[PDB]
Design a protein around this ligand. Structure first.
Ligand SMILES: O=C(O)c1cc(C(=O)O)c2c(n1)C(=O)C(=O)c1cc(C(=O)O)[nH]c1-2
Ligand SMILES: [La+3]
Length: 579
C-alpha cells in the first residue's frame, strides 16, 4: 500500500515486521550509535500475559504501539502517549486443537499495518483486518483448515490494494501456497501454489525462467510421482519482500512433504525454491530451486534481502538469501540469475558446493555428498554427522543488512544432526514426517551452537564471526549508528559494532529472545525494543514441556542446557538513553 511506503519513509515508525519492503532490517535512526550505546538503559517494560515463544516485533504506527502474542495471538494496542496504557485489546477465539497441529511451538511472527488497519494472521489460518484506532474487525477470512493440519505462523505482506499471506504445514502433508486477499473487503484474488499443475502454480511455461531458461510445461508435475504433490509441502511461513520498481514480490517455499526421501522420488518442485511473483496476478516471472529433492528438511523460506550493490563493477538489483542448507545465495532479483552461492558456516558438509558453471550439466544444483545423504543411506538407516541440522545454519530469525558497511549480519546456528528416515503413510490431520533426529553441537569450533557473523554477499565470505554458547534464534537489526542488535537464547540483548564486531552492550532480558529487535522514535527520542520469551524449535523443550531426548523432533535433547539459563516468558523490553 501507499500507506506502507509512507511508513517506511518515516524512520520513527515500524509498519512492517521486515522494517522495509526490501527486508533489509536497517533503520536510519542514529541517536543510539556506537559511541553511546554503552549508556543504553531500560525505559519501560510490558508483559503480554502469554507464555511459550514470542517471535516477531511490535509495530509502532504514529504514537501507538501494537504488540502481538503467540497462540491465541492476542493483539494489544499501547498508547505511547498515555504511558503505554492498553487502549484496545483483541483476544481471538481459536480451537486449542490447533496447537498439536503445529510443527514447532505456538509462535506467531507479527502483524502488519496498511490503510489504517492492523493485519493479523491467526494460528488457525484466519486472516483478520482490525481497525488501527479501535480494534474493531473490518473482515475475517479463513485461509485454510487446521483439520487437515494447516496452520499459520508467518506475517502478511500488504502490497497496493492486496494482502499476500502464507500457510504452514510442511510437516503435515499440506499442499501449501500463497494467497492474495483484497485489502478493503478480504475477498480472495489469486492463489499461487508452490507445487502442482501449472494453473495452480500460476506460472507461464514459456516466459517463467529458471536459471535463465524457461521452465516449460508441467515444470512441477514432472518431478513428482503420481498424486503425492497433493500432499507435497513447500510451505510459505517465512518473510516476504517486494520491489515496487520491478513489480515483484519474493518469498521462499518450504520442505517437500515428508522427511523420508525414498518414498518421494524426483526433484519435488517447486519446494525449496525462491519465488518472484506479480503481486496483482500472482504470475511468477522467475523461480529458482535451492535444495532439489530434499533429504534434510532445509526449508527454503528464509528472507530475501533486496539490495542495490555493485557486482563486477555494475550496479545490479540483487537478492541475498541465507538458506537453511548453509548456503548464502546472491541472485539478480530481476532475472533470477544466481551470482554467488557459498557456505556461511565452514562446517556445512551435506554438499561440496553449488555448481555455478554455466555449462556444467549440473548448473544451479548442489553437489550432494553421498556420505551425508539420507536417501542414499536408505530408509531406517541413521545418517550420522550431517551439518547443519534440520533447523539449518539459519532458521526463521531474519538477518540484517548495513548499506554503510555493505555487510550482512546473520544470526546463525552451529548444530549437526543424526538423521534416520522411515516410510510413513499419510493421514489427514496427522503428522507426515517419517524421521527420528538427534541434534548436537558441531564437533569443531568451541562447543557453541551459534554464531553472529558478518557476510559479504558479492564474494561470499565471512568478514568476522562472533561465537555464542547457544543458537542465535533472534532477529538482528542494523542502524545508521553503526550498531547491530540481536538477542541470545540465554536472554541477552547484545549490540555489536557494525564494522569491528566488538560487543558494546549486553543486558539480560527476562527470557530467551527469539523475536526480532526493532527501533522507533517517540517525542523525538529513539527507543529500541525487543520481545523476550524462549520458544520456537530451539526452545521447544521448554515450551512444550518435552522430557525425551528425541521428542520435539530432536531439538528437545539438543538444547537441554538451555533450561539452566531461561524459563518461559512473555515480556516486551524497551531501551533508550538517559535524558
Ligand atoms: O514446513 C513447515 O510447515 C514449517 C513451519 C514452521 C512454522 O510454521 O513455524 C517451521 C518449520 N516448518 C521448520 O522446519 C522449522 O524448522 C521451524 C522452526 C520454527 C520456529 O518457530 O523457530 N518454526 C518452524
Ligand atoms: La519444515
Amino acid at each position: 500500500n501507499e500507506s506502507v511506503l509512507k511508513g517506511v519513509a518515516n524512520p520513527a515508525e515500524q509498519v512492517l515486521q521486515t522494517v522495509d519492503y526490501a527486508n533489509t532490517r536497517y533503520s536510519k535512526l542514529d541517536q543510539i550509535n556506537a559511541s553511546n550505546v554503552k549508556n543504553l538503559q531500560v525505559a519501560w517494560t510490558f508483559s503480554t500475559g502469554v507464555l511459550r515463544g514470542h517471535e516477531g516485533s511490535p509495530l509502532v504506527v504514529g504514537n501507538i504501539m501494537y504488540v502481538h502474542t503467540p497462540f491465541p495471538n492476542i493483539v494489544y494496542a499501547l498508547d505511547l502517549d498515555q504511558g503505554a496504557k492498553i487502549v484496545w485489546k483483541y483476544e481471538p477465539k481459536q480451537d486449542p486443537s490447533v496447537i498439536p497441529v503445529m510443527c514447532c511451538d505456538t509462535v506467531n511472527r507479527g502483524l502488519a499495518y496498511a490503510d489504517g488497519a492492523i493485519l493479523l494472521h491467526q494460528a488457525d489460518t484466519t486472516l483478520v483486518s482490525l481497525d488501527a484506532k479501535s480494534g474493531k474487525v473490518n473482515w475475517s477470512v479463513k485461509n485454510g483448515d487446521p483439520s487437515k493440519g494447516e496452520t499459520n505462523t508467518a506475517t502478511v505482506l500488504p502490497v497496493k490494494d492486496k494482502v499476500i499471506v502464507g500457510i504452514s504445514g510442511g510437516e503435515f502433508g499440506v499442499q501449501c501456497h500463497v494467497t492474495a486477499y483484497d485489502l478493503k473487503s478480504g475477498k480472495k484474488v489469486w492463489r499461487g501454489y508452490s507445487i502442482g499443475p501449472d494453473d495452480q502454480l500460476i506460472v507461464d511455461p514459456e516466459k517463467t525462467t529458471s536459471l535463465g531458461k524457461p521452465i516449460g510445461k508441467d515444470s512441477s508435475l514432472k518431478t513428482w510421482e503420481g498424486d503425492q504433490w497433493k500432499t507435497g509441502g513447500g510451505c510459505t511461513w517465512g518473510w516476504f519482500s517486494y520491489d515496487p520498481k520491478l513489480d515483484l514480490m519474493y518469498y521462499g517455499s518450504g520442505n517437500p512433504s515428508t522427511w523420508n526421501p525414498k518414498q518421494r522420488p524426483g526433484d519435488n518442485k517447486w519446494s525449496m525454491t525462491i519465488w518472484a511473483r506479480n503481486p496483482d496476478t500472482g504470475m511468477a516471472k522467475w523461480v529458482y530451486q535451492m535444495t532439489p529433492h530434499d533429504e534434510w528438511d532445509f526449508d527454503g523460506i528464509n528472507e530475501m534481502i533486496l539490495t542495490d550493490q555493485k557486482f563486477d563493477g555494475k550496479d545490479r538489483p540483487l537478492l541475498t538469501h541465507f538458506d537453511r542448507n548453509g548456503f548464502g545465495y546472491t541472485l539478480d532479483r530481476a532475472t533470477g540469475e544466481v551470482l554467488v552461492a557459498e557456505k556461511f558456516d565452514p562446517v556445512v558438509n551435506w554438499a561440496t558446493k553449488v555448481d555455478l558453471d554455466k555449462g556444467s550439466k549440473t548448473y544451479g544444483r548442489p553437489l550432494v555428498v553421498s556420505k551425508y545423504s539420507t536417501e542414499q543411506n536408505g530408509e531406517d538407516v541413521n545418517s550420522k554427522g550431517i551439518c547443519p541440522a534440520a533447523l539449518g545454519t539459519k532458521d526463521q530469525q531474519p538477518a540484517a543488512f548495513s548499506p554503510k558497511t555493505g555487510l550482512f549480519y546473520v544470526p546463525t546456528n552451529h548444530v549437526c544432526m543424526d538423521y534416520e528416515p522411515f516410510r510413513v503413510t499419510y493421514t489427514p490431520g496427522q503428522p507426515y514426517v517419517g524421521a527420528t533426529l538427534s541434534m548436537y553441537p558441531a564437533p569443531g569450533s568451541h562447543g557453541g551452537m551459534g554464531n553472529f557473523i558478518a557476510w559479504d554477499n558479492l564474494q561470499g565470505k565471512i568478514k568476522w564471526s562472533n561465537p555464542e554458547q547457544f543458537s542465535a534464534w533472534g532477529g538482528a537489526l542494523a542502524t545508521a549508528g553503526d550498531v547491530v542488535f540481536y538477542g541470545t537464547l540465554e536472554g541477552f540483548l547484545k549490540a555489536v559494532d557494525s564494522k569491528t564486531g566488538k560487543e558494546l552492550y549486553k543486558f539480560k532480558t527476562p527470557s530467551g529472545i527469539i523475536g526480532n529487535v526493532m527501533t522507533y522514535e517517540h517525542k523525538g527520542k529513539q527507543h529500541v525494543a525487543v520481545l523476550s520469551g524462549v520458544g520456537g524449535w530451539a526452545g521447544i523443550g521448554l515450551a512444550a514441556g518435552l522430557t525425551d531426548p528425541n521428542a520435539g523432533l530432536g531439538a528437545v535433547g539438543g538444547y537441554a542446557a538451555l533450561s539452566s539459563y531461561t524459563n518461559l516468558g512473555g515480556q516486551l523490553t524497551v531501551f533508550s538513553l538517559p535524558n
